[model samples]
Target: ALTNLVAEPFAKLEQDFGGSIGVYAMDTGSGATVSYRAEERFPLCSSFKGFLAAAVLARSQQQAGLLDTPIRYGKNALVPWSPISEKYLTTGMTVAELSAAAVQYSDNAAANLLLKELGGPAGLTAFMRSIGDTTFRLYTSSPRAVTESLQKLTLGSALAAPQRQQFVDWLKGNTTGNHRIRAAVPADWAVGDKTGTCGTANDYAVVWPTGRAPIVLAVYTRASEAVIAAAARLALEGLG
Candidate 1:
């Protein structure tokens, strides 16, 4: 309790939710982590979209003009929950636009297009190997898997500075995570995040705390998105 201030509050939070909470928060400046059930597996469906965006950015580094290439897909491309892609079905979208849509809207159709470009989820998995992120997958990854991978993608050398910032910029514009992790972040700080809801609520974010380097965090709840935000606030408090 002395060392891990988040432990007891996390336990109480889990009890309040009547489900479970898995959290991993790393203060990049200090190398301090507040972890609670972070190793447990959970769904990170939309969070993967952000990862997918970075994967595309990584490929763009290899293939010139990739991000600028416009993709013209037919009506059949639209899928459930594809809010942004549906808006421009008549007009084709650039790879960059699609990637932004995938993170900002959790657009499934946008992801489908990107997946085929990567040659499949396996290739997606393959890119992660170069970053030494074995904990990641399309879905069902641990909180540790999420924050660690995001840390590298955002702050580490996983992608060059341009590509990494593009990834973060897209996340900064995301709409869904607002009520999740974004809710917990103070107005003075900047937080970019994505949310994925399956049977539970999940959020992954990079927070630029004022006067600090940055913090990477992922919170998954078997209970509610409510818990996700609550856990995030707790993690920030402990980090302070």
Candidate 2:
């Protein structure tokens, strides 16, 4: 059913783009879904920050004021993909601010600091399972570990209303990956999403089309930013 709608477009995308890709989308209102290579694990790059943010939110629920708790970063925490951290290098920042930068700018230093606050790779893995993900794995401690390791992740279950809404709000202000999935949606629509890049360009979103159900979309591609954007556009266009 839904698979038929996405198949041809995705096949064409793979042929033209010449790279591995994964996609998953669900219509929250109708319970309809479409998927392509949905189960294959892909390198998360900065996309792992979303799950890290969720884990941080979950921790905040357990320990009151955790989200607002302040965390200090030294020169050692600085790594690449961090526009905000570069400005505030060697300073103290609250967990909420780090979460914001992680989602908004895909800041690597913010993500690594948050991960350290969450208790390193082992702790993050545990928290990830506690939330529902089984296939995802994180092997390294720092953002720079991307080149040395293959971080695998998936678009797990949609988070509950409060947590999901909180994350969605943060993602709506995201300032990165304009050429990715954000390009696929109409300007007038409400979209909350995150993007990651390394050897791959990935975007996962919750998009609300006018007079239609909200859709959760996850797109991953080992292609250029523009190619990923084009693939996402083709995938969304199939819904019509």
Candidate 3:
């Protein structure tokens, strides 16, 4: 596990950021696994939806189902986006639709609905167990908690190759709260990962073409308005 090498950066960030920062990682690509407080629980935020995708996929993979399976809807089902209870939404969305919205748009309604499909908290927990994701979890059964928690997410535990690349695409042109990670790195290189912020900040991504000894990176920080994105970018560039 690259756990040892990964801690050095966290220490540096703590010195610079002047607050509690969390770090955890499991890079299947290189078989490197590490964590400072991987089990030190934190809110799931919308990043938890990534796990929903797996819960849904776990069964689908077993049954060999279609990714475009139609998902039904109901009255007042559309969740509208608002700073407070304005997650205005539509009547229905599919697995693909929910996945795209959840991952791409970070759709809160889609996330809750997915939460329901997984059989509520029990389903979500079962899914985690099934996938062996010991560190990921939800706060409660209430849609309200799910909504707020989605925004608090600062880490993602399990990610596949396709999702990894998609993250790269977003990081190259992504924004969480406001800052983008690539803003911190060298202009010539590319960085990829999911990001979360709610005063607290986080990013977990892989630098491209790591070649033989690719680096897996995770950065989590809280407090202050700093150039975190730019810092992450610089970190990845140095990893080369």
- C-alpha lDDT (0 to 100) for residue 91 of candidate 3: 44
Compared with the true structure, model 1 gives a TM-score of 0.94
Off by over 4 Å in 1: none
lDDT preference between candidates 2 and 3, better one: 2
Candidate 2 yields a Cα-based lDDT of 0.69
Best-fitting candidate, scored by TM-score: 1
> Tens digits of per-residue lDDT for model 2 on 1-240?
545867877887777777877776665566555667766667777777877787787787658788778776667878877788777655678898889888898888898888888788677788756644566576322222221111122222345456656776887888786777777789888877777777666777767789887676677776577766776676566554
Each prediction's number of clashing residue pairs: 0, 0, 18
Candidate 3: residue 171 Cα off by (Å): 9.2
Alpha-carbon shift of residue 117 in model 2 (angstroms): 1.3
Listed in order, each prediction's TM-score against the native is 0.94, 0.85, 0.62
Question: Tens-digit lDDT track for model 3 on 1-240?
Answer: 334565676567667866665544333344444545434444444455554655655555445543467566554545653221123233435665565556545556676666776788679788555544444455422222221222222223333444434433433343342344445544455554455544655555444443433345555555532545644543443332
Checking candidate 1 for backbone clashes, the offending pairs are none
Query: Against the hidden true structure, what lDDT does model 1 obtain?
Result: 0.84
lDDT of 1 at 106: 90
Please tell me which model should have the higher TM-score, number 2 or number 3: 2
Instruction: Decide which is better by lDDT, 1 or 2.
Output: 1
lDDT string for model 1 (122-223, tens) is 777877777887876666788988888898888887889899888888888888877778889877889899888566778999988788788899888875
